[PDB]
């Protein structure tokens, strides 16, 4: 219970659950009426979630409070991803390079959320270009990167993902 005792594998299992709700509730809030936006990703619209839980709330809350910030980056990330041209073959390699560079100057909660955001954007981008069935691969990218690059330990040492529920204005 006391801070420091939580295992990285516990955080890893929780990360999968957090990321699913992050993806679901982020995609839900970004949809627009009257056909003015890009078509929804049905894999995200119907993504199965575990029964309502604290880890589900973490993913949802991080998507919601990040909404305004995320939307301001839409056009630039759309441009950068089109340039990157991620594919099923190179997505792992590119994800690893980008995530490593993200955290090179340190870990903080905002950068952890940015990694969730990148997973979301990468998964949406490859789906829009015809790569179905890849959301689980991207989820594994996120979970495994955190586990192998100290992020899961950083979260665990702070009590796990539940600590993120204190993020807010």
């Amino acid at each position: 219970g006391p801070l420091g005792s939580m295992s990285e594998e516990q955080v890893a299992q929780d990360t999968e659950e957090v990321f699913r709700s992050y993806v679901f509730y982020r995609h839900q809030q970004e949809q627009e009426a009257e056909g003015v936006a890009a078509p929804a990703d049905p894999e995200m619209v119907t993504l199965p979630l575990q029964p309502s839980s604290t880890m589900g709330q973490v993913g949802r809350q991080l998507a919601i409070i990040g909404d305004d910030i995320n939307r301001r980056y839409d056009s630039e990330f759309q441009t950068m991803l089109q340039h990157l041209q991620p594919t099923a073959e190179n997505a792992y390699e590119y994800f690893t390079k980008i995530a490593t560079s993200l955290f090179e100057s340190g870990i903080n909660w905002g950068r952890v959320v940015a990694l969730l955001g990148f997973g979301y954007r990468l998964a949406l981008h490859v789906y829009q270009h015809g790569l179905t069935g890849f959301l689980g691969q991207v989820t594994r990218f996120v979970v495994d990167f955190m586990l192998h690059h100290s992020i899961a330990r950083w979260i665990a040492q702070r009590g796990g993902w539940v600590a993120a529920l204190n993020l807010g204005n």
């Binding site: 910030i69 390079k97 490593t100 560079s101 903080n108 905002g110 959320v113 204190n166």
Partner: peptide
């Protein structure tokens, strides 16, 4: 310009640090 994987990381860090400044007490 710089390679897209480099730019993406820079912008993720920029965004992350904005989030941290706004929401991490």
């Amino acid at each position: 310009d710089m390679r897209p994987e480099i730019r993406i990381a820079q912008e993720l860090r920029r965004x992350g640090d904005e989030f941290n400044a706004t929401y991490a007490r």
